[PDB]
Design a protein around this ligand. Structure first.
Ligand SMILES: Nc1ncnc2c1ncn2[C@@H]1O[C@H](COP(=O)(O)OP(=O)(O)O)[C@@H](O)[C@H]1O
Ligand SMILES: Nc1ncnc2c1ncn2[C@@H]1O[C@H](COP(=O)(O)OP(=O)(O)O)[C@@H](O)[C@H]1O
Ligand SMILES: Nc1ncnc2c1ncn2[C@@H]1O[C@H](COP(=O)(O)OP(=O)(O)O)[C@@H](O)[C@H]1O
Lengths: 370, 20, 370, 370
């Protein structure tokens, strides 16, 4: 039973889905399970009471949105099961879980208990013939067509750097922080309360993400922007009310480089990228500096790569050629590589079959991933 | 002491019992 | 026992009744109990001494009229029991109370004691098999065919704006004010005494309602009409004596928008419509502005809808699509939706049965309405 | 110029005033401006046309009251200028603003624009020699004499919990809600209308506060109190008409614990207290649990601290010593600590002088507070 396998790029913010050997993921929607805040009195209302995908994006104001997945660590399993059931349902894919093998994605250095429970869901609740969990950094390199390179990515949950050299991922040189898009949006929300405009509700949180996506830019010199007075640019909400954002728009994404602002003494994106290159072997460092691949959502800030370069110029050894490559399709780079990995003939050897899982269990899944 | 509002017999605090 | 159920659209000014699945209510009559002032010396007179419906409208001058219901809250319960008995009697419906289920209507945020006392009357004095109390806003949307939209209504009793988005009524955004048609008619009478043509008797009060219905208009700019001098247009009374109305015609319905004139600091219709939309969540506000439904008799003033839009343009955020829709039969909006709701098969599940009331009591009625 | 400084404890509900180095504030009055509704035909009336303090409390019925501050955020700046002028005037303090340094108070995480405009008022309109702004939690701990303490406060506007440990206020562990005494009083008013007794005017609103202050208690188990039938206790108005309160007395303060009753998903008082201790560092949690201090007026409900213990026992880790402390003088705890802070010799270093304000501006005020 070797049908066209399904690639599901998991993540805290957004969940991409689709079939192998496609150019772009056709089925992208945000990873959350909205449930109604108000009491349905009238008949002919929205049926079901559990809303995932575009219906949730259309009817945000009704639904109390809550995310099941934080920092690449699923908290609520019942919600993730309903999301994966929605992916496979007739509203999006129009296929059965029994036909196709699955390609799953997870962030590196996650809990092994979550990986086991992920496999239990796909093998037992859904009746998948073969599952395969893989890393995001390896898939991003598949999408670019490279073999060498450090992979700085920044989704909604996790920011991590994986140094890989000619198809040799170094697990001990991996760095990781739990400071990413969601924490930047949460830090922006807190700053807008200091400005004046509060967005306390859970549906109203999605407005802060929309402000962060559109109206934010990373300044090169933060001390110079702090001394100067801002212009206070405007932004229109979904209602119509105007909002002067002020200095919060540039100070909000600075969380990624300075994680002491939120109150969590970590490295930062630029330090993680240097640390990953430093922890790797001496002869590989110069090739790892030249090949740096960007990915995820929080790399799409304005002047992000300019600041990332300037930070590497500050930290790294002098007279060394830095190159921070960035594709066009940075959000879908992790999915595209999965679709490439799925299409290859080697894919049949990498996966965990259903029969193999029934015999061994979790140990076979831990062996095949690494 | 003087002033309109006070509470009589709430106590200063409510504490759980200390175990060994 | 599932007979063709009765709809009783309750109201302070007018009461409308009939059966389920009918196009228009056949039995529309005013909600009051006229009792004779004068002594009956001569034989062959009007018998009964308690007049309801067309007999009371025909013989106004004899009868000391008194309304049992003020602001959707019955004070005189004995009179409402006599009205409901008159509805069921051979003079109007020609049916038994024991056969048919009842669809009663009440305004939102009323006293719960009146709701229990309403149920006691229908279950014990009349022997109803099943009763159901509903809201005026939900029924108006059933009549139109929509699910979305704010329902601004203004009868003789209450003015209230209930925001409902896709079959989800929000109970904490329901605005209400006791400033409706009866208070406008009372304010018109007080103005006509200032003009010269005073009225005092209860039969004579209904002439002021007839003046309010016919010869009144809401100006767009009230300050401009105040500076200009009126023409003093005429109106002929039921007797024959002419009355030059003057500025009392246009300043009377201004009470609905300016409740400071009667001497009671409330919101007003236009503020209630905006406040109900503003109390809801951010994403639903623009859809609630696009769908505004008018209802009741006090929305039928000349230039009322034009003034409502001007007030919404003033208060609401700029560059938003406003649309104040309405039915053709604005007085029969709530009844038609009830007749639709009654004829649905789900109506059997919604109601409070007689057996369920005898077991539980008031708690089961408070569990089923809201 | 170092005279005996003034301590203005701001707040939406009540404003306390007086001099430094005192046991209790001499000048306590509610924070609102009263202006007359009606016309003054007869001479020898109450002069001024603006009523603040005991005159406004005495003559409520005339005055259309309006609160300048909502949730520790002054909306009407002209009204607060009149109140602060009234505080300084001969009717209360009997002193000039030019002599004494000022100690101002604000809730944490407020708009910075309001803090700037507050400083502008005290430095420009009034001619203050030196101003200082402080937090509620730091002042509450000064009054008790502690350094370690989580300060769960609950005023009229804001509820929050700042976890301080040995003179180290953690700014990122601060949890805040805009649900407090005013919203509970507004929620009680809505229930009383559902019971039967309607209140609408601003003078009439303060009766609902007086009912909330007197006859309200927090049930230890709300589901048990729901299933049981209440006793329906009485209350006498200034008019003399009796009011059966019923279940609304115990259900009103449930807004503090369940903020889903008003229809606005927040954390709640008990969750804010736990979340503040959880957001702080690992080793500080057990000391923060042991030192939980209460303050503000909405902590004075009957069985509030008992229920707040039970909620902490439900949420927090098992076998930990919980101690919710609460002084005799909870209402004036914030003022007492300000008077103690003002009396200390370090106070001269912390403040912002008028000369320093004229040179730098708003930036110097933002630097000195944090
Ligand atoms: N143009 C943008 N600029 C900055 N941040 C963005 C942009 N677009 C999306 N984001 C943020 O990044 C997230 C999307 O990144 P994604 O790679 O899908 O993360 P994950 O794979 O973990 O779901 C969104 O949740 C959003 O908060
Ligand atoms: N054409 C009209 N213009 C102005 N007011 C009207 C008009 N027709 C009726 N009214 C007023 O509105 C009331 C009818 O509204 P309705 O919603 O039926 O009241 P109820 O609360 O009794 O249901 C009447 O009592 C009358 O005072
Ligand atoms: N004994 C009491 N019981 C319940 N609530 C009270 C009591 N005393 C005061 N309150 C409430 O607390 C508020 C005053 O608290 P306070 O701490 O002075 O607020 P702020 O300092 O923000 O003005 C009042 O508005 C009142 O509603």
């Amino acid at each position: 039973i070797a049908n066209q396998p399904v690639v599901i790029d998991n993540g805290s913010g957004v969940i991409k889905a689709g079939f192998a050997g496609d150019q772009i993921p056709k089925y992208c929607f945000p990873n959350y399970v909205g449930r109604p805040k108000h009491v349905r009195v009238m008949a002919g209302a929205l049926e079901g009471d559990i809303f995932i995908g575009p219906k949730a994006e259309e009817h945000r104001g009704l639904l109390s949105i809550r995310y099941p997945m934080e920092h690449g660590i699923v908290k609520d399993w019942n919600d993730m099961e309903r999301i994966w059931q929605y992916v496979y349902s007739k509203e999006q894919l129009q296929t059965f879980s029994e036909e196709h093998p699955v390609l799953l994605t997870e962030a590196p250095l996650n809990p092994r208990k979550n990986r086991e429970r992920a496999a239990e869901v796909f093998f037992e609740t859904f009746n998948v013939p073969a599952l395969f969990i893989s890393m995001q950094a390896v898939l991003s390199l598949y999408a670019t067509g490279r073999t060498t390179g450090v992979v700085l990515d920044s989704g909604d949950g996790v920011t991590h750097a994986v140094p890989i050299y000619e198809g040799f991922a170094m697990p001990h040189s991996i760095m990781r922080i739990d400071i990413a898009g969601r924490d930047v949006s949460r830090f922006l929300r807190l700053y807008l309360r200091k400005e004046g405009y509060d967005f306390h509700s859970s549906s109203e949180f999605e407005i802060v993400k929309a402000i962060k996506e559109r109206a934010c830019y990373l300044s090169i010199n933060p001390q110079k922007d702090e001394t100067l007075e801002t212009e206070k640019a405007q932004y229109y909400l979904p209602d119509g009310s105007t909002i002067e954002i002020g200095p919060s728009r540039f100070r909000a994404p600075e969380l990624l480089f300075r994680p002491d602002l939120i109150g969590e003494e970590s490295e930062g994106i630029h330090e993680v990228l240097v640390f990953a290159i430093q922890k790797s072997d001496m002869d590989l460092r110069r090739t790892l500096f030249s090949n740096i691949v960007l990915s995820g959502g929080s790399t799409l800030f304005k002047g992000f790569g300019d600041r990332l370069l300037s930070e590497v110029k500050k930290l790294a050894p002098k007279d060394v050629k830095i190159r921070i490559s960035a594709p066009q399709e940075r959000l879908y780079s992790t999915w595209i590589g999965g679709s490439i990995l799925a299409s290859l003939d080697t894919f049949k050897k990498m996966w965990v079959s259903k029969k193999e899982y029934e015999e061994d269990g979790a140990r076979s899944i831990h062996r095949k991933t690494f | 002491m003087a002033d309109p509002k006070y509470a009589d017999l709430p106590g200063i605090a409510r504490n759980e019992p200390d175990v060994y």
